[PDB]
Design an enzyme around this catalytic site. Structure first.
Site, PDB file in Angstrom:
ATOM      1  N   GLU B  58      20.737   7.545   6.481  1.00  0.00           N
ATOM      2  CA  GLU B  58      21.721   8.018   5.525  1.00  0.00           C
ATOM      3  C   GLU B  58      22.502   9.165   6.146  1.00  0.00           C
ATOM      4  O   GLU B  58      23.723   9.160   6.120  1.00  0.00           O
ATOM      5  CB  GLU B  58      21.049   8.450   4.229  1.00  0.00           C
ATOM      6  N   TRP B  80      21.156   2.654  -1.212  1.00  0.00           N
ATOM      7  CA  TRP B  80      22.478   2.654  -1.853  1.00  0.00           C
ATOM      8  C   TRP B  80      22.887   1.351  -2.539  1.00  0.00           C
ATOM      9  O   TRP B  80      23.896   1.325  -3.232  1.00  0.00           O
ATOM     10  CB  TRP B  80      23.562   3.103  -0.877  1.00  0.00           C
ATOM     11  N   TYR B  94      30.418  11.043  -0.223  1.00  0.00           N
ATOM     12  CA  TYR B  94      29.976  11.947   0.835  1.00  0.00           C
ATOM     13  C   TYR B  94      30.736  11.934   2.152  1.00  0.00           C
ATOM     14  O   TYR B  94      31.624  12.756   2.353  1.00  0.00           O
ATOM     15  CB  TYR B  94      28.487  11.777   1.077  1.00  0.00           C
ATOM     16  N   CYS B 146      25.767  14.393  -5.832  1.00  0.00           N
ATOM     17  CA  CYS B 146      24.766  15.330  -6.381  1.00  0.00           C
ATOM     18  C   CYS B 146      24.626  16.572  -5.524  1.00  0.00           C
ATOM     19  O   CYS B 146      24.587  17.660  -6.069  1.00  0.00           O
ATOM     20  CB  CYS B 146      23.408  14.690  -6.518  1.00  0.00           C
ATOM     21  N   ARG B 166      24.300  20.009  -7.787  1.00  0.00           N
ATOM     22  CA  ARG B 166      24.597  20.062  -9.245  1.00  0.00           C
ATOM     23  C   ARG B 166      23.588  19.280 -10.115  1.00  0.00           C
ATOM     24  O   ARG B 166      23.456  19.520 -11.329  1.00  0.00           O
ATOM     25  CB  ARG B 166      25.999  19.492  -9.529  1.00  0.00           C
ATOM     26  N   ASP B 169      17.354  14.900  -9.039  1.00  0.00           N
ATOM     27  CA  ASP B 169      16.199  14.134  -9.498  1.00  0.00           C
ATOM     28  C   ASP B 169      15.033  14.614  -8.661  1.00  0.00           C
ATOM     29  O   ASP B 169      14.927  14.232  -7.488  1.00  0.00           O
ATOM     30  CB  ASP B 169      16.419  12.646  -9.262  1.00  0.00           C
TER      31      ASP B 169
HETATM   32  C1  LIG Z   1      21.809  12.011  -6.834  1.00  0.00           C
HETATM   33  C2  LIG Z   1      21.794  11.703  -5.436  1.00  0.00           C
HETATM   34  N1  LIG Z   1      22.742  10.883  -4.810  1.00  0.00           N
HETATM   35  O1  LIG Z   1      23.640  10.151  -5.563  1.00  0.00           O
HETATM   36  O2  LIG Z   1      22.728  10.761  -3.592  1.00  0.00           O
HETATM   37  C3  LIG Z   1      21.020  12.596  -4.578  1.00  0.00           C
HETATM   38  O3  LIG Z   1      21.243  12.612  -3.349  1.00  0.00           O
HETATM   39  N2  LIG Z   1      20.098  13.353  -5.154  1.00  0.00           N
HETATM   40  C4  LIG Z   1      19.846  13.281  -6.450  1.00  0.00           C
HETATM   41  O4  LIG Z   1      18.951  14.005  -6.940  1.00  0.00           O
HETATM   42  N3  LIG Z   1      20.595  12.430  -7.273  1.00  0.00           N
HETATM   43  C5  LIG Z   1      20.260  12.285  -8.685  1.00  0.00           C
HETATM   44  C6  LIG Z   1      20.559  13.402  -9.690  1.00  0.00           C
HETATM   45  C7  LIG Z   1      20.711  12.551 -10.951  1.00  0.00           C
HETATM   46  O5  LIG Z   1      19.421  12.365 -11.528  1.00  0.00           O
HETATM   47  C8  LIG Z   1      21.318  11.211 -10.488  1.00  0.00           C
HETATM   48  C9  LIG Z   1      22.848  11.192 -10.514  1.00  0.00           C
HETATM   49  O6  LIG Z   1      23.231  11.234 -11.893  1.00  0.00           O
HETATM   50  P1  LIG Z   1      24.333  12.216 -12.527  1.00  0.00           P
HETATM   51  O7  LIG Z   1      23.807  13.608 -12.283  1.00  0.00           O
HETATM   52  O8  LIG Z   1      24.312  11.835 -13.993  1.00  0.00           O
HETATM   53  O9  LIG Z   1      25.600  11.878 -11.749  1.00  0.00           O
HETATM   54  O10 LIG Z   1      20.944  11.093  -9.111  1.00  0.00           O
END
Ligand SMILES: *[C@H]1[C@@H]([N+](=O)[O-])C(=O)NC(=O)N1[C@H]1C[C@H](O)[C@@H](COP(=O)(O)O)O1
Ligand SMILES: *[C@H]1[C@@H]([N+](=O)[O-])C(=O)NC(=O)N1[C@H]1C[C@H](O)[C@@H](COP(=O)(O)O)O1
Lengths: 264, 264
Positions: B58, B80, B94, B146, B166, B169
């Site tokens: 990635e 992805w 990104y 994120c 922002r 998870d």
């Molecule tokens: C989003 C993510 N990503 O899209 O690559 C990443 O790299 N890390 C994350 O933690 N990730 C998480 C946060 C959230 O739980 C979802 C995205 O949802 P929204 O915040 O509602 O956009 O993916």
């Protein structure tokens, strides 16, 4: 304030000496976070007098999307004078990006209005964000935004906000930067019928200029007072309709003002 | 890792229940900061096996400015797949913004190359920043970034980096997000002849999905192991010339992998 003096002490104890853009020299730490529950009081520094007129008018000016200093001058605020061109222009700084971020395809995006729509229609969204860091226009700006990026957050009926500040002048900037965002939070929560929650400040290069050392030692000998209370007197039709006199800061009793040279 | 489990525990004790975009439901806190000294070891979670192939590919993919999943598939990485259109496209996410942020006036800006120039010519600068949050293009993105905004910092011969995320998870994303940036820091410091300093992680909406509760309780019963060591075997001509096999993670001995459903 407690959190503010602990931060000041930490840069003194833990900062490394650094050169910087201005030639001034600094003690600097990297990465620090502080939380202010906006319910405990309005986070206005009490260990020196802060000029409220300036803090408030800058915010109002940002909300307008004005990037020219004329509005500040009409209102006797001179905190931007060192950086304007002869026409009093700063380039597409803060307010331009908040109100009218230019897209590659010709449009302009009003992030403030976007944000009220999200807070009114989708409070749990995790994308309630305003950015001043428009990479495409940094080189037109008199100065890169120090307070660059901020996020709102709603839970349990309360509005929270986190600010990422890439560069913090702890003595001169931070006391304004905090009052200023705390204000926006109160304004936004009012507009959205929310309670105020926390304001979370996050810094990158967090520093004390080398010719702020006596001022810093002086302010650290002072005992902090009870925080003032912010009162908004009227509920304007819109976030863009606040007037300077809608705000009342009650119970504000600082130690005296402390002068320090600006780093240009 | 210590800091990682303390965070997991904190969301369990202090999170409020929240609805979210996916319909899944979460326990969520707002605003949290953790520091990793990259000298103590490579911050790869040991209380479950993490898939290194995916983390590394990635990152390499981001550095290319590729926003199509074909490169991931050639390399058997499917993280992805849930978000691509039938052509395998994600929109200007990104890597597009890192490598080729589009200006309103027609140009494209390569922030990565910009950043190497700053680190090679002006290490004290406080504007060594990469942003993925291109407001003008959010609506073209399969998903808002994120991990949105990051800043480099040099002092005492060491490279540091802070990430503003922002939306985190905690169970599925954070263990990748950390390994991934720690990697970029090592790569960048190598390219710039610097020592590694700290990686500072800053979160906004930091959450545990409601159907990660048994997985979370399981991982919190595990004792963390010694951190692995990252070895880069070759010094490529440029930050864009790394190959998967230039990296060796030595001493990595995790507890077993723990499966959990992705929130789509
Ligand atoms: C989003 C993510 N990503 O899209 O690559 C990443 O790299 N890390 C994350 O933690 N990730 C998480 C946060 C959230 O739980 C979802 C995205 O949802 P929204 O915040 O509602 O956009 O993916
Ligand atoms: C910058 C500033 N501003 O331009 O409005 C602000 O609001 N707060 C600040 O702390 N501030 C400081 C940080 C730094 O010391 C200088 C800007 O210099 P660079 O970081 O070199 O751009 O102003």
């Amino acid at each position: 304030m407690k959190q503010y003096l602990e931060l000041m002490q930490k840069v003194l104890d833990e900062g490394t000496q650094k050169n910087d853009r201005t030639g001034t020299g600094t003690l600097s730490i990297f990465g620090h976070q502080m939380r202010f529950n906006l319910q405990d009081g309005f986070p206005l520094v009490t260990t020196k007098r802060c000029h409220l007129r300036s803090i408030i008018h800058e915010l109002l000016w940002f909300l307008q999307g004005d990037t020219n200093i004329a509005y500040l001058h009409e209102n006797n605020v001179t905190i931007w004078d060192e950086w304007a061109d002869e026409n009093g222009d700063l380039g597409p700084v803060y307010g331009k990006q908040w109100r009218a971020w230019p897209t590659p395809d010709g449009r302009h995006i009003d992030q403030i209005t976007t944000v009220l729509n999200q807070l009114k229609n989708d409070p749990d969204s995790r994308r309630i964000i305003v950015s001043a860091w428009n990479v495409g226009e940094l080189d037109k700006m008199a100065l890169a935004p120090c307070h660059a990026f901020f996020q709102f957050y709603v839970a349990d009926g309360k509005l929270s906000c986190q600010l990422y500040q890439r560069s913090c002048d702890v003595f001169l900037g931070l006391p304004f930067n905090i009052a200023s965002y705390a204000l926006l939070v109160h304004m936004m929560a009012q507009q959205c019928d929310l309670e105020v929650g926390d304001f979370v400040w996050t810094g990158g290069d967090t520093h004390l200029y080398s010719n702020h050392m006596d001022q810093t030692h002086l302010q650290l000998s002072r005992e902090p007072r009870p925080l003032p209370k912010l009162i908004i007197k009227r509920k304007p039709e819109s976030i863009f309709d606040y007037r300077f006199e809608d705000f009342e800061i009650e119970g504000y009793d600082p130690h005296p003002g402390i002068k320090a040279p600006v780093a240009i």
